[PDB]
């Protein structure tokens, strides 16, 4: 069964990558692993793990129990076909092929799925099979195979409303858009937060709340924060259960810049330890800094640099080296003076900065059709 | 008939249907011409 199956992958992440933190994960992950017939996905996890020398009988009792479930499919397919129902063979392994998917690998779980895809004339089984292929397409991070059945998925919701098959689906596309650094799309798929349910994969709905606020606080601007996430009763009460995130969100909204970094180290470090955010938490807070710098710095023109330590965040030379790499990083549109100790702003009219991305994409497609025109016709 | 792929043919005894059965269809048995032409078929009737 694939409904608890993501926590398994997250605890594989919890096992391997925190290197010192490798004891309770190889306890509880084994505690889930040498039961519920799991055989295949942890041989190289045993390689990353310790020896665990006597696993032979442990594998034999479970390939034996697996052999029981396979041999009773072999007890099922022939009474299923003598008196045929709705192809009762594929009706048996249309449900036990997911047992072949958690327990077996993707091959017996894939074929039998594309096999049983042609059985049910209605999408009430088909699209949920597609949901299973999406979920294993996440487990093996099959980033191209998700592209297929996302479209093949979406091709079925137009007939019907199927908002349990679309609002559930948008959770998947939000998790992919936050898997990659596509955050304006990740919050956009995370826009509703109402028809989203107390899920299986974010079994805390409030974890989903934390994720949509963390992506939204970059993804949308104030005209959207000061109406959207500040006036949602559906969003206010669930983080009313949160002290930190409520403070962490409001420290930007209430201009509380000094306590903002305090919670930023904690939230950013939690994002460091979190699975699937671990690729991009650096990308997160490098935007959070320059966003908080730009937000205050587009209010004043003649603000000195020794203002921001005691009021914005302490360390004058820290502000110096942090701003110098952001103007020098080509963003944070201003100009800092040094030996009269004052920071000036400017304004770029949207004619140069807007031009920049245009010449970027033009050079990219120039590279593209350059490369193709070399490739084809020898 | 949808799942076993039988020709689901109900009858209503309407007269718009009648022109496809025949000019008059003095019987109902003229329907069997099309029925054995769609030979795995199911005829359906109302009250």
């Amino acid at each position: 069964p694939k409904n608890p199956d993501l926590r398994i992958a997250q605890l594989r992440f919890l096992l391997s990558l925190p290197e010192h933190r490798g004891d309770a994960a190889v306890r509880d992950e084994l505690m889930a692993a040498v039961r519920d017939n799991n055989m295949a996905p942890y041989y190289e996890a045993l390689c990353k793990s310790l020896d665990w020398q006597i696993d032979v009988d442990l594998l034999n009792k479970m390939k034996k129990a697996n052999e029981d479930e396979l041999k009773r499919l072999d007890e099922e397919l022939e009474d299923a076909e003598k008196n045929l129902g709705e192809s009762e063979i594929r009706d048996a392994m249309m449900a036990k092929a997911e047992y072949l998917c958690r327990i077996g690998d993707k091959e017996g779980a894939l074929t039998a799925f594309r096999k049983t895809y042609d059985k049910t004339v209605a999408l009430g089984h088909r699209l949920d099979i597609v949901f299973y292929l999406l979920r294993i397409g996440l487990f093996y991070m099959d980033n191209d195979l998700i592209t297929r059945n996302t479209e093949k998925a979406k091709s079925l919701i137009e007939e019907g409303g199927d908002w349990d098959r679309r609002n559930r689906l948008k959770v998947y596309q939000g998790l992919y858009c936050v898997a990659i650094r596509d955050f304006k799309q990740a919050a956009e798929l995370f826009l509703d937060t109402v028809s989203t349910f107390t899920s299986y994969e974010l079994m805390d709905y409030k974890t989903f709340v934390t994720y949509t606020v963390y992506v939204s606080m970059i993804a949308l601007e104030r005209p959207d924060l000061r109406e959207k996430v500040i006036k949602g009763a559906e969003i206010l009460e669930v983080l009313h259960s949160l002290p930190a995130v409520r403070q962490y969100l409001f420290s930007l909204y209430e201009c509380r810049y000094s306590v903002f970094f305090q919670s930023l180290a904690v939230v950013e470090q939690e994002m460091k330890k979190d699975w699937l955010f671990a690729p991009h938490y650096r990308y997160y807070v490098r935007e959070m800094r320059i966003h908080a710098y730009s937000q205050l710095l587009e209010s004043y023109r003649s603000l000195t640099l020794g203002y921001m330590a005691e009021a914005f965040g302490v360390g004058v030379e820290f502000i110096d080296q942090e701003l110098s790499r952001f103007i020098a990083a080509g963003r944070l549109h201003c100009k800092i003076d040094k030996v009269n100790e004052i920071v000036e702003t400017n304004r770029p009219d949207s004619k140069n900065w807007q031009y920049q991305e245009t010449i970027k994409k033009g050079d990219l497609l120039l590279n593209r059709v350059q490369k193709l025109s070399r490739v084809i016709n020898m | 008939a949808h799942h076993t792929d039988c020709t689901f043919i109900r009858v209503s005894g309407s007269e718009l249907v009648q022109k496809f059965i025949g000019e008059g269809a003095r019987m109902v048995r003229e329907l069997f011409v099309m029925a054995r032409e769609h030979a795995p078929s199911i005829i359906f009737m109302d009250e």
């Binding site: 089984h125 | 949808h2 799942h3 020709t7 109900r10 209503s12 718009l16 249907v17 496809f20 099309m34």
Partner: protein, 48 residues
């Protein structure tokens, strides 16, 4: 290739047969559609 119950293209001067006009309708698909039964499935069966 000449099928019974099939349209044709026809020249008009000598009524020489010109070309096979594709196909028109089944006499069951036509009236059948005119009826428009609400097609169903197992997946919409409530407890039967």
């Amino acid at each position: 290739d000449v099928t019974p119950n099939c349209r044709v293209a026809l020249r008009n001067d000598s009524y020489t047969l010109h070309k096979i006009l594709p196909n028109k309708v089944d006499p069951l698909v036509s009236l059948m559609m005119v009826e428009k039964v609400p097609d169903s499935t197992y997946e919409m069966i409530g407890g039967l």
